[model samples]
Target: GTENLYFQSMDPAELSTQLSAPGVLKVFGDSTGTHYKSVLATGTSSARELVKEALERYALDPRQAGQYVLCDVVGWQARCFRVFGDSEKPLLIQELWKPREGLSRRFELRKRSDVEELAAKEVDTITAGINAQARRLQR
Candidate 1:
C-alpha cells in the first residue's frame, strides 16, 4: 500500500522575510531539501516514522504537503504561496516563526557587483570547498 505525497516550493519573498526575522535557523546549502530536527527519533520503533510523526506534531496534511494549507502548520490564517505567475527562475522560500513588515514584504534583491574583485579570489576558495561537497551528492 502506497500513500500519496505532493511537493511544493516555498515563496521567495517569504524566504527573505524569514531570514531577516529574529531567532530562526536559516539553511544555506540546499533548496532541494528541507530539514527536521531528529530529537524525536531517540526512542522506540517510531524512529523511522519521524516524517509521519512530524506532520502530526507540526499539524500537517498527510497526502498533501501543499496545494492546501493546514491549520497545524500555518495556523488559521494565510494559505500557501502562489508558486508562479510568469517566471523562469525557481522561487526561494524562507521559513520563520512569523511574517515581516513594509518594504520587506517585497523582493528586494541587491544588484550584482564586480566591485568585490579583490574579495572574489579569497571567497572562491571557501566557495569551492562547499561546491565540491555539493557536487559529490550529484553522483
Candidate 2:
C-alpha cells in the first residue's frame, strides 16, 4: 500500500499557510530559476535531506546528489554567503542570520562545479544583469 500523500490534496489556502509556517525553509533550483520547493525545518533535518528533497521535487537523478550543494545566497546581488556542508543543519544556519533583512536571504541549490568555477568578476557581472532585469520589471 502507498503511504505517501501529495500536498495537492489539501486546499490551496491551507497549503500556503503550512508552507509559510515558522520552521519552513524554501529552496530554489539555480538552473531553473522559477522552480522552488519548501521543506520543513527541524533539528534533525540535515542539509543532505534538503538537497534530497530538492532533487526529488525537480525529478533529478538521485545518484548524482553529491554533485550539488546548498548555498546561502544573500542580498540583491545574490552573493553566495556559504555553501552548506552535507551534515550542516540549514535551519540553524539560517537562524544565525535572522537579524538580517528578510528579502536579502535565500537558499539556493547549485551545482558544486558551478559554485567552484565562477570567478568574482563573473558573479558581479551576473548580479548586474539581474539588477537590470529587476529595474525593468519595476517599470
Candidate 3:
C-alpha cells in the first residue's frame, strides 16, 4: 500500500497539475488564508512543517480538555484534524501528545482510531488521484 503512493509532498500549483484538478476537502481545523499563503510560500514541503508547527504550538500550552489536532498525509496532501472531544476524558488528545516539546513530531506520532477510517479513505482517494496522473504520463 505504501508503494502505491505517488508524492509524499508536491507544489500544489505545479506538481499537482498532473493529477485530477486537485481539491482540498478540509474536514476540520481553524485554518486561514494567510496561514495557507505562508505555508505555500515557505516551500512545497511546508505542508508537513505546518502540521509539525501546529502540534508543537499546542505542546507549548498543554490542554487537558476537548481539544487536539490530528495530522494525516496522503501522497503530498496533508489533513490536520482539529479535534474537540470530551473535555473530562481527554484521553485521545493526551495520547497523541508527547511530553517533550521541540522533538520531531513526524513519525513518532500515533494514529487515533476515532478517525482512522476517514483518514484511510482520504489517503486512498489522494493516492488514486495521483496515480491517475502517473498513468497518463506513462502513455
Candidate 4:
C-alpha cells in the first residue's frame, strides 16, 4: 500500500519570516551526490518531503561516525543551529514545532549568509511565546 504526500516550497518572504523567527531550528549543510540519489528515491513529486528525507539521511556522518547536533527547548523557547561545510556551499532550513497544530513546520531556505546571521536573534521570542501560552492556560 502507498500514500501520497503533497509538497510545497515557501516564497521568499515566508522563508524570511520563518528563518528570523525565534524557536526555529536552523540547519545548514553541504549537498552531495549520495544525498541527491537517496532523495530522488521518491522521485521528483515531493519537494519538501524529499528534501526532509534527504536531510534525515545526510545529517549523520557515517564516514567519521559523528552525530548530528542535539535539538531541544528551554523553559518556553527551543532552538539550535547545526552548520557544516559553509565554505564549500551550504544549505539551510528553518523548523518550528507547532504544538497547537500537532505538527512540525520546516521551511527550505535559499539565502545563506543572511539566514545564518539570524541564527541567534530570536530565541527569546520563542520562549516568550511559550510562556505566554502557559500563562493563558492558567487564567
Which one is best on TM-score? Answer: 2
Positional deviation of 103 in candidate 2, in angstroms? 6.2
Candidates in order: C-alpha RMSD to true structure: 20.5, 13.4, 18.7, 15.9
Question: Per-residue CA lDDT of candidate 4, range 62-89, in tens?
Answer: 3332222222211122233333221111
TM-score of each: 0.18, 0.62, 0.24, 0.21
* Candidate 1 residue lDDT tens string, 11-48: 86754553243332121111123443222322121212
Residue 18 lDDT, candidate 2, scale 0-100: 48
Against the hidden true structure, what lDDT does model 3 obtain? 0.36
What lDDT does each candidate get? 0.30, 0.72, 0.36, 0.35
Query: lDDT tens digits, residues 31-137, model 3?
Result: 22213211111212222333444444435333321133334322112334333221211222223344344332222122345456667888999999999999999
The stretch of ten residues in a row with the least summed lDDT in candidate 3 is 34-43
Report the lDDT of model 4 for residue 21: 35
Stretches off by above 4 angstroms in model 3 are 1-81, 88-114
Query: Which whole-number lDDT from 0 to 100 does residue 34 have in model 4?
Result: 13
Q: Which one is best on lDDT? A: 2
Ten contiguous residues minimizing lDDT sum, candidate 4: 85-94
Please report the TM-score between candidate 2 and the true structure.
0.62
| Residue 117 accuracy (lDDT) in model 3 | 67
lDDT of 2 by residue, 34-98 (tens): 55788767644678878887777778876788889888877545654578878776775675455
Which residue pairs of candidate 2 clash? none
Q: After TM-score superposition, what is the CA distance of residue 132 in candidate 1 from its true location, in Å?
A: 12
Model 1 regions lying over 4 Å from their true place: 1-42, 64-139
